[PDB]
Design a protein around this ligand. Structure first.
Ligand SMILES: NOCc1ccccc1
Ligand SMILES: NOCc1ccccc1
Ligand code: NA
Lengths: 346, 332, 324
C-alpha cells in the first residue's frame, strides 16, 4: 500500500491503532492516521467510480443522532454506512432538549451504546459531545458541534486539496502550498479546523476579510506554533487582505466561506460584505492556472453560478469526496480485524 | 421465456432501454415498458405471496425525499427497496422551504446524486421535480407533485385493472373496457393520469360528477387524441353523468375519488352493476365508500394499494438493475 | 436446548409462536417464556463474543411510534438490524397527525400488505387492538395507554432470572422477594411485571406514599396467580411507606423525598440484592449507586436488545437456531 508512491502505509498496523478510536477533533488524527485515511478514501473513490463492490464493512449497526438539522452531513454519513454494507438507526427532527426529555446525557449515551457498534453525533452544544464520549461504551464520530469541531469536514477539505497538490504531504521547504481563506473568518469554523490541519505542513495563508470578521488571534497563534515546529514559519507565512484582487494572487487554493445575513447589524451592512467578496469569472482571471476553488457549502451568493463551468471550481467534487472520506474513516475505526486481502485496493 | 398471458417480452432489450431512465410522468413509459412493468410486477406478486426470495436488486443505496407528508406512498417505496434487498436513506418530516434553506434545488440534487444510485422524490412544487431531473446525475422516480404527475399510482391502477380484465392489452375492436370515474374529476389528478394511460387502449369512459367538479376539457382532448391514434374513438367513447344509477351501468371498473352526499358507494348502488365489475379507490377514503362494501367481492381498493408494492419493486428493478443475463430476472 | 435443567423444544414452541402478535404479557405462556429466556441468553452470549447475530435476514418490518419513545424505538430498530432484517420507520408524529382523517383499520389493513410485521407504540388504548384486528401481519406492542408493554416485562423478568434463576422452578422452598418502590398507582411497568412474577413463587413488598399505592385489581391478580400454583400466604403481599422496612430481605429492588435510593439506604439489604429501574431515572437513584455492584438497571436496559431479538426471531422465523 503506497500513497504518492513515496509513503508506504501499513494499513494493518494503522488499523490496530485506530480500532474503536473516537474522532471528536482533527487533533485526534496524527500523520500515520491521516495517510491511512487519504489512501483508503482514494480506494473508495476509484471503487465507486468503477461501479465495483463497496461492501468493506458489512455486519455493523450504527446510530446517527443529529440534534440540529444538517441534512447534507447526515445523508453523507448514512450513505457511507449503507454503501459499506452496514446498517443505521437514525435520530433526526429533534433538538438537545426534546431528545434528552429530562434524562442526563450520561444515562442516554450509556444505554444507547449498548445497542450499537458506533454512534455518529451532531449537536450544537460542545459540552454534550464530550459528555457522550465519557459515557459511551462505543466509539463516537463528531459530525459537528458548537466549538466548530467538525473533523470529517477538515479531512474531506484536506483530501480535496491533496488530490490537486499532493506535495502538501512532503514537508519539503521547496514545495509550499499557498491558500486564500475568503469571507467570514470569525464565524467560518471550517476555516479554523482546516488551518490547524494545514499548519502541520509547508503552507502559507492569505486571510481575506473585512474588519469585524477577521480570523481570530488564537487560530493565528496555533498556525504560527505549528509552522515554527516544522521550520516553515516566516514573515510571509500569514498575510491579511481586505480585497480579492490582492488576496487571490499566487494561491493554489481559494476556500470561500458562508456569509450569512444574520451576522451583520442590518441588510445594508450584509449586502456590502457580499458583493465585495462574491467570486466571479472576472475575479478569477489573475489567479494561477492551477488554482482550485473550495466551499464547504451550501453556496448562496458567495460564488456566482457561472463559476461552476470554470474548470478551477471543485466545491461539488469536494462535497462528493465526503462520501469517500467518511467510508474510509468508518472502515479504519469499526473493522473487527484486518487481513492483507480484505483491505480496499482498486 | 418472458410471456404476459401470450405476449413475448424481451426483458433484456427493454431493460437496456429503461436502464437509468427517470420516470416523472406516465408518458415516460411506452408500450414495451408497460408490458415489462406488468410482467415484472406479476413475478414479484407471486414471489412474495409464496414467501420466496425477493432480493433481485441488492447493492443499491437510494435516497427518498418526501417534502410533504405522504406516509402511505413513502412506506410503499421504502418497503419495495428493502424487499428487493437494497438500502435507503430518508428525508421526510420537512417541506420545500425548510429542506432547501435558501440553497438552490439544482445544487441540492447535484450533491445528493453523488451519494446514491437513485432518488425517490415527492414535492408539491411542479418546478422542483423538473429542476431535480436536470441537476441529478442519477435517475429520479417522481412519487407525486403539484401538476398531478404520479406515474407509480397510474401504473399500479393499471396493473390492478389488467389483473381482472387482461383484454385491455389486446387493442381488439371487439373487447372494449368501460370505466366509470366517480367524484371530484376536476381535482382528482389520479383520474387525469390513469385516463391518459387507459386511452392508449380500447376503453370507454363514464365521468360521474356534480357540475363544479367535472373532468377538465384538456383531459377529454388527450383521451380523444389517444383513442383516435388506435381508431377506438366514437360518439360513445366518453359519456358524462351526474348520478350513479346511470354512471355505474355496464362498466367493468368503478374508480372512486376523495370528494373533499350524491356520490357515496353502497351495496344498494352496486345492485345494477355488471357481475364482473371491480371497485378501485387510490385511497385514503372518507365516506365515498361505506365499510359494508369492503365485504362485497367487487371491492379491490385494498388489493390495489397492496399492488403498489409489486409495481414499485418492478419499476426499481427494471431501472436500477446492472445485470447482464436473462436467467437472472424474476421468473416464478 | 436446556436452561441448565429444563429441555426446550424450540422447534415445537416456534411452530406455536409463528406469526403470533404480542400485545399483553398474558399472550406469553410458560413454554413461550422459557423459549424467550433461552433464545435471549443465546443472543446475549453471541453479541458479547462478537459472533454473527444474523439469525433473521430477509424480513422487512415497519416501526410505528406515535409518541416519542426514542429509547424503546432504537432498541427495537437495533434488534431488527442486528438480526439482519430491515425496517421502515414512522416516528415524530402523534395519533391525530398520522391518521389525518383515515381510520386505524384502513391504515393497518394497507400497511400490513407492505411488511412482514409491525412494531406499534401508541398512547391510545383502543388503537393497538384495532390495529391487531385489521393487520394481516403480526403486531408487537411497544407500549400503550392501558399500560401493556410486554417486551419491558419480558426484559425485566430476563434480568431477574439471570441473578435468581430459581424463579422458574416453582419450588415451595425457593421463594423470591421483590420490593416495588415509588409510584405503584401509575407505574404500569410494576403492574405488568407483578402479573408475570405472580405466576411463580414470589413475595411482594409495595413501598409507596399512600396516594400512589399499588391498585386493588393488581393485588387481586397477584393473589389469583399465587393461589393457582399454591404459593399464596398471609406474607405474600406486604405494604410499606418507608425504605428501611421495605428493602429488608428482598432479592430485587425495582424503582420507578422518602423513596430516593442511596448507598446509605442499601447498607441493610441482602448481599445478593439487585436494583432494577425501567429508566429513565430523575432523582429516584443517586449517581453514587451506579458504582455499587448491586445496581443492574443499565445491564437491564441492555438486556432489552437480547429479549427483542429473541422475540422477533421466535415469531418471524420461517424454520440452525442460535446456540453457544
Ligand atoms: N396516514 O397514513 C396512513 C398510512 C400510512 C402508511 C401506510 C398506510 C397508511
Ligand atoms: N433520552 O434519550 C434516551 C435514549 C437512550 C437510549 C437510546 C435512545 C435514547
Ligand atoms: Na432506515
Amino acid at each position: 500500500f503506497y500513497i504518492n508512491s513515496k509513503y508506504k502505509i501499513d494499513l494493518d498496523k494503522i488499523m490496530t491503532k485506530m480500532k474503536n478510536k473516537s474522532v471528536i477533533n482533527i487533533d485526534d488524527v496524527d500523520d500515520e492516521e491521516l495517510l491511512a485515511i487519504l489512501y483508503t478514501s482514494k480506494q473508495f473513490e476509484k471503487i465507486l467510480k468503477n461501479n465495483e463492490d463497496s461492501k468493506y464493512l458489512e455486519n455493523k449497526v450504527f446510530c446517527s443522532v443529529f440534534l440540529e438539522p444538517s441534512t447534507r452531513t447526515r445523508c453523507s454519513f448514512d450513505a457511507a454506512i449503507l454503501k459499506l454494507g452496514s446498517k443505521v438507526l437514525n435520530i433526526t427532527d429533534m433538538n438537545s432538549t426534546s431528545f434528552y426529555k429530562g434524562e442526563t446525557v450520561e444515562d442516554a449515551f450509556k444505554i444507547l451504546s449498548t445497542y450499537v457498534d458506533g454512534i455518529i453525533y451532531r449537536d450544537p452544544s460542545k459540552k454534550n459531545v464530550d459528555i457522550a464520549v465519557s459515557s459511551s461504551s462505543k466509539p463516537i464520530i463528531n459530525a459537528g458541534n458548537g466549538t466548530g469541531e467538525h473533523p470529517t469536514q477538515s479531512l474531506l477539505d484536506f483530501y480535496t486539496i491533496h488530490n490537486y497538490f499532493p506535495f502538501i504531504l512532503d514537508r519539503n521547504i521547496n514545495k509550499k502550498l499557498n491558500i486564500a481563506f475568503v469571507g467570514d473568518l470569525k464565524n467560518g469554523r471550517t476555516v479554523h479546523s482546516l488551518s490547524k490541519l494545514l499548519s502541520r505542513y509547508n503552507v502559507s495563508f492569505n486571510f481575506v476579510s473585512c474588519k469585524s470578521l477577521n480570523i481570530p488571534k488564537d487560530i493565528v497563534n496555533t498556525i504560527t506554533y505549528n509552522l515554527k515546529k516544522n521550520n516553515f514559519y516566516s514573515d510571509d507565512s500569514i498575510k491579511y487582505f481586505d480585497n480579492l484582487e490582492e488576496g487571490l494572487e499566487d494561491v493554489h487554493i481559494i476556500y470561500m466561506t458562508r456569509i450569512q445575513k444574520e451576522r451583520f447589524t442590518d441588510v445594508d451592512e450584509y449586502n456590502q460584505y457580499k458583493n465585495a467578496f462574491i467570486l466571479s469569472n472576472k475575479t478569477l482571471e489573475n489567479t494561477r492556472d492551477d488554482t482550485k476553488i473550495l466551499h464547504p457549502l451550501p453556496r448562496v451568493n458567495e460564488i456566482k453560478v457561472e463559476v461552476d463551468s470554470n474548470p478551477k471550481s471543485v466545491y461539488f467534487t469536494q462535497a462528493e469526496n465526503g462520501l469517500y472520506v467518511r467510508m474510509a474513516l468508518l472502515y479504519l475505526i469499526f473493522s473487527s480485524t484486518s487481513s492483507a486481502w480484505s483491505h480496499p485496493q482498486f
